[model samples]
Target chain A: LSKHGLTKDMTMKYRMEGCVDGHKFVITGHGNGSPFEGKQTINLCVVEGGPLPFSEDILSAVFNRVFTDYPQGMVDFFKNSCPAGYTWQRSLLFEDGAVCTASADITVSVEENCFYHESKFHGVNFPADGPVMKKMTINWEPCCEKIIPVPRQGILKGDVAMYLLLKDGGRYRCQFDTVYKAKTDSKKMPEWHFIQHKLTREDRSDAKNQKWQLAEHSVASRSALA
Target chain B: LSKHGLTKDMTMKYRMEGCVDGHKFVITGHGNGSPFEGKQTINLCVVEGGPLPFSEDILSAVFNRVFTDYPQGMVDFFKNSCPAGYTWQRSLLFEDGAVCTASADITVSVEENCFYHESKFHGVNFPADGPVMKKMTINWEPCCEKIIPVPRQGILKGDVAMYLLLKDGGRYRCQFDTVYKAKTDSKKMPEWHFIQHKLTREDRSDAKNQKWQLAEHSVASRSALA
Candidate 1:
């Protein structure tokens, strides 16, 4: 997919969600792709292209919705895949165009050691309506004692839906509804170099915070994916 | 509220979903009420007002859809009031006023034990669409060698799901959907002989397939709600 400069242009990444060893994790990806990719072992606690960290409370509870509420495998298709585990890997293949990543978009590490997931139901949190977006600002209670300590958390309410189906049985099924904020960074930012907005971790290893793993190493030693 | 000769008609029944010990289960209820109401253990394997065994495959996989793939706790609102487990008291507020069960409405239990959820979400399959009824015919492969002889064995899915969450956190958050037949008894069964359409166990003891539990005893001993 990296063959075309358009691969960098068209494959805009937005959000990434997956579960390794059962712990579901959601991360912000760049339309040009955020740091939650390429098996980099990124910090579990940080968000790239921005200053927020992945909150245990937030990330933990973040997916409680899909983890427990949405029933369609489309949730798998939309926010997840590689069902065996993270193969579909939660990367949204949203758009294609000129791209500008946030400064952090080009940087290697996020400042906060937190992981927060903000999505509707992946598949672009598809609703009754067919709309698309590049990014979303998840506004929530910043890591409170009640949650797992992840950042920006809120009880999600899916207001949209779809008509989809299963890959295996060919059953008539409705697509899952999604929940999230309106598109942001809609203006498209600069320092934000264009990157692969689409995304994955093709491994069965474990849910080791990629950002954290990278954090353990020295900044100079890190070959952060810009 | 069971005083009137017609306490049956005013209250309607819809669909329901919930979990116990993480085991997914589905029930028919009302947006205002359903089999998920009023001090009744009704029947886990049967419909109210007349003669119909809730398709083991149908009932089993119905909630499995909600419990497994549908997250966001809507499962709690639907079949499950609590995802952690079933409150242990299933009930139905069906009425016995003007009984109107479908010709196909009354019949036997399902044959398949294989549970393959195929609903994008359950609410989409909700009963308020109160679209009628029919004796669904759930024909699927028999439980290979992985589950219990317990009729509608699709429950094995939930059994399998929880194991992962324990080892796992949020795996696929569902990636779950369901497949089943519509009410073959689409005549809109009645509240006539069925005073309370919804039914439930007064206690959290265990699965007492009332049909079976009552069968163990003589019809004389059975306070069969019919």
Candidate 2:
């Protein structure tokens, strides 16, 4: 029903904002013609280190590896329900639709005035042979008006698990989970939560920092509601 | 005795040559006057993941941390026996004398590249809480020429142990041994070897990688030395 002429699934876009040293981030996904949509605003400092910086190309590579060509087992678990012929494309837009040609599954639009590596997944993952149970958080936010919805709020939640094979052939596993909630009306509010855990040679352990917590509440209301 | 006021602990310098991304890379280093002398040529392909393109600044930062800080307790162990105020400096003549600095307990010139890393010793004494180990490699060719009787004939051999702390505060240990044989005028060969092994772990039932076999080996010929 929107620009893409699709009714069931709305078009969603993700982008990188601000500078590397700053901790502000926005991740948005919305369906066209429907009031179901949301955005998330996150503060990255809670995590120990911070997010890593990579080109949009690398994000796409990770996305493709995770969504499309990922191992059949993982794909079946994450996106098996998607319709056939479904494809996802990402673009890097700078200053009002000034998009870059180099597109990937993830798009990083560099803003000279803003910090580059802020607001990213903070935490290191050592392979299975290494120590485990590292916990971290990821802050996400919506990027544009098209991604906003009306009444029904859109929710974002997912878990990431990584298995590392050490040189000695031993394995380590680390997992993280995050949730984002946004209301239809911009004045209403947006919310987020995160959790993480790890499995090592010893018994499985959870990160001391793991918890369902809000990243930033009433973010959209800051400008008006307050 | 050689140039630069030859002494028992004088330092020397030399050039390094090897493949970096299929192309040859020529770097320089100083050494503590030891039996190990002369230039050495290394094959980058032998290195896992091939050659990497690193900025001189990043390389220098790592070098400074390795040599000056002596992160992995190596320098600290030898500090008392080394000459007073002994420091290691590396310069790239081909690149306009870009200098990297380090410190040593012993006052000797070295003329070869040494690899090292920073690690945390968790289980050492009373399970020290996160004592950091900065692993690094140092090139000491420039400094090597000043001290050794047959500067180009001696080699240095050493070993390092790595330990990991599990989720339940259990411990695991591994060791890596390295050997570096200098290139002699008569033999025109540089020899080196590395071995890795798993030593201890918290879980008595968990099988460790006890095979301490050679991970790498190489020899240099005079005509093809770095």
Top of the candidates by lDDT: 2
TM-score for chain A as predicted in candidate 2: 0.24
Quote the B-chain TM-score, candidate 2: 0.22
- Regions more than 4 Å wrong, model 2: A1-38, A41-209, A216-226, B1-57, B64-115, B119-226
lDDT of 1 by residue, A1-226 (tens): 2111111111222344422111234555422222222212232333422222221211222221111112222121112211111110011111221110000011111222222332322111211112112112122211101111111321111221111122232322121222221112112111211111111112122354333222111010111385
Error of 2 at A14 (Å): 15
Model 2 chain A, poorest ten-residue lDDT window?
A: A57-66
Q: Model 2, range B111-222, lDDT digits (tens) per residue?
A: 4223221110001001112211111111111110111122243323333333334344444332222222222222222233222221121111123321111111111111
Native contacts present in each candidate (fraction) = 0.00, 0.00
lDDT of each prediction vs. the true structure? 0.20, 0.22
Each model's TM-score? 0.20, 0.20
DockQ of every candidate structure: 0.02, 0.01
**lDDT score for residue B24 of model 2:** 25
